Amino acid sequence: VGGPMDASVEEEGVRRALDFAVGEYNKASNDMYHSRALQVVRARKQIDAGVNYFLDVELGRTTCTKTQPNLDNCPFHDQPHLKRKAFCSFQIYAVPWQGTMTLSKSTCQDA
Amino acid sequence: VGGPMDASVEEEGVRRALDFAVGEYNKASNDMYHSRALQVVRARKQIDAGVNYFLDVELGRTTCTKTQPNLDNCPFHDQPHLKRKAFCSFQIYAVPWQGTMTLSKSTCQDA
Numbered sequence: 001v002g003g004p005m006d007a008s009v010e011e012e013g014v015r016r017a018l019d020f021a022v023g024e025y026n027k028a029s030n031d032m033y034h035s036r037a038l039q040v041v042r043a044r045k046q047i048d049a050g051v052n053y054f055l056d057v058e059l060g061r062t063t064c065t066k067t068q069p070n071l072d073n074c075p076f077h078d079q080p081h082l083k084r085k086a087f088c089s090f091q092i093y094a095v096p097w098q099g100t101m102t103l104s105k106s107t108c109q110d111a
Numbered sequence: 112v113g114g115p116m117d118a119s120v121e122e123e124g125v126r127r128a129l130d131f132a133v134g135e136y137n138k139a140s141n142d143m144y145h146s147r148a149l150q151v152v153r154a155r156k157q158i159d160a161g162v163n164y165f166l167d168v169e170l171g172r173t174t175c176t177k178t179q180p181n182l183d184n185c186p187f188h189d190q191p192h193l194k195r196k197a198f199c200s201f202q203i204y205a206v207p208w209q210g211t212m213t214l215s216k217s218t219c220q221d222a
Contacts, residue, residue, distance in 0.1 A: 004165055013205065017164040020212045021201040025170065025219075026177065034182045035170045038196065042167040049160040053128040054115055056153040059136065059146045066137065071145045085149065090132040094124065101131045108136075 004044035014043050052104075053092040059108070060085050086110040115155035125154050163215075164203040170219070171196050197221040 007014050022037055029035065060076040061084040077083040091105035118125050133148055140146065171187040172195040188194040202216035 017203040024214045034175050034177050035172045038169040038171040040168045044165045046163045052157045054155045057151045058149040060149040061144050061146045064145050066145050092128040103135045
């Protein structure tokens with residue numbers, strides 16, 4: 001009911017996946033020795049569609065603290081050394097059946 | 112040709128996305144002040160399907176260094192304090208048209 005279906009380690013995409021993983025494990029790992037798979041205890045897979053949102057947005061620093069109300073519409077800093085406008089690029093990954101979002105990518109260039 | 116289609120900031124899922132993002136921006140940010148969107152310069156979206164692989168795997172530390180050949184089939188450490196078997200869970204996100212993989216999740220419990 002909804003979850004990942006089993007797949008044979010024999011399967012092409014699974015070998016690719018498993019090779020990739022062990023690969024990253026070794027690259028990241030700090031061992032001078034190479035590790036490799038003894039045995040795959042379980043391999044499953046899930047086709048999963050989601051929407052990516054790409055938003056390019058200018059943010060302004062408002063005059064309200066995070067610990068106060070109305071934040072939605074309160075006014076931007078006009079004092080000279082207090083103001084900051086940043087320009088940001090956000091990538092958001094949305095799985096709509098699940099109602100969840102993740103910030104995949106985030107840069108603010110700030111100016 | 113292949114890339115993200117424009118979407119109206121008026122659109123429901125986009126407001127959700129933009130609110131989510133600014134939200135995370137503030138949570139992560141170190142400012143005592145709240146930032147909010149001045150203007151959204153550009154908003155696009157892409158429906159994108161990929162396969163998730165979930166692999167549960169026991170890894171063994173082999174006797175070969177990373178800087179030598181045959182690593183695919185070379186033998187595990189048998190000396191007592193040199194051997195390590197770990198048991199790992201890897202989540203791999205594959206976009207097959209693009210031929211790319213990402214390690215989304217990775218834990219080795221080590222024993």
